[PDB]
Amino acid sequence: MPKNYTLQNASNLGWLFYKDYYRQEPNVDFISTQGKESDTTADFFRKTNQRITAYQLNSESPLVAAFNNHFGTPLQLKTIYPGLITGSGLPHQTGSKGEFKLGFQFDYTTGLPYIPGSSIKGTLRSMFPFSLKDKGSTKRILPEYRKERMEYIRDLI
RNA sequence: AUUAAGACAUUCGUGAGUGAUUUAUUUCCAUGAAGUGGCGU
Numbered sequence: 001m002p003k004n005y006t007l008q009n010a011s012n013l014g015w016l017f018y019k020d021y022y023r024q025e026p027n028v029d030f031i032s033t034q035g036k037e038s039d040t041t042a043d044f045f046r047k048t049n050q051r052i053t054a055y056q057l058n059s060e061s062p063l064v065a066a067f068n069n070h071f072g073t074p075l076q077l078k079t080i081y082p083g084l085i086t087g088s089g090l091p092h093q094t095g096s097k098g099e100f101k102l103g104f105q106f107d108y109t110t111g112l113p114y115i116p117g118s119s120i121k122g123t124l125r126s127m128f129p130f131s132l133k134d135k136g137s138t139k140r141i142l143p144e145y146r147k148e149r150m151e152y153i154r155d156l157i
Numbered sequence: 158a159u160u161a162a163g164a165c166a167u168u169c170g171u172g173a174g175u176g177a178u179u180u181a182u183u184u185c186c187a188u189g190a191a192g193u194g195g196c197g198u
Contacts, residue, residue: 089184103184115183122183133182 005055005112007062013113014106016052022094030096037097045098063110086115128153 001009011020022030028044029035057064068074090103107114125131129149132138138145 087184089186105184119183119185122185124183126183131182 002054003056005057005061005063010055010111011051012106012111013052013055014104014108014111016048017100017104017106018092021048021092021099030094036095041096042098045096049098049100057112063112086113086119 005013025044028040029038030041035041085102085104087103087105090105092103093099093101105114105116106112127149129146131149132142132145134142
């Protein structure tokens with residue numbers, strides 16, 4: 001329940017972060033200015049965040065094992081500490097104290113944090129010379145962009 | 158009783174066969190978890 005996400009005893013992390021985050025509880029107020037700055041609202045959001053940040057993932061996870069079976073052998077890389085953020089632009093904000101102000105990218109079905117394939121494709125393409133579209137606004141930086149990226153791609157290849 | 162009388166432009170016949178609303182596109186850019194000591198002279 002509290003840790004070890006799994007599929008039998010878990011709460012959908014995206015559900016908790018987006019739909020269940022701002023559930024209306026007795027004695028909890030964040031409609032008024034006083035309510036948004038109150039300590040009760042801060043405690044409510046603290047408990048919700050603690051519920052969010054209590055789940056671990058095992059290496060032998062049936063979810064991850066199914067992902068490996070469906071999509072082949074993965075490329076395993078490890079996160080370093082500034083942290084890692086995905087889907088920062090998703091609207092998640094009311095104006096209260098102790099709440100998560102930025103968005104997060106959760107899978108709808110599994111609820112696990114993930115990076116969409118579009119994000120990976122765009123990030124990888126951005127380091128290639130012809131990622132920038134030849135347009136009126138981009139034509140000033142277009143030659144330098146390709147010139148700089150082509151050398152990088154050449155050495156990497 | 159008169160170059161006259163009789164005679165359906167009709168029968169059969171699928172607007173049907175092939176076709177991916179798809180290709181290209183980073184929810185990203187900027188941002189200090191910081192500021193301050195106070196009194197007992």
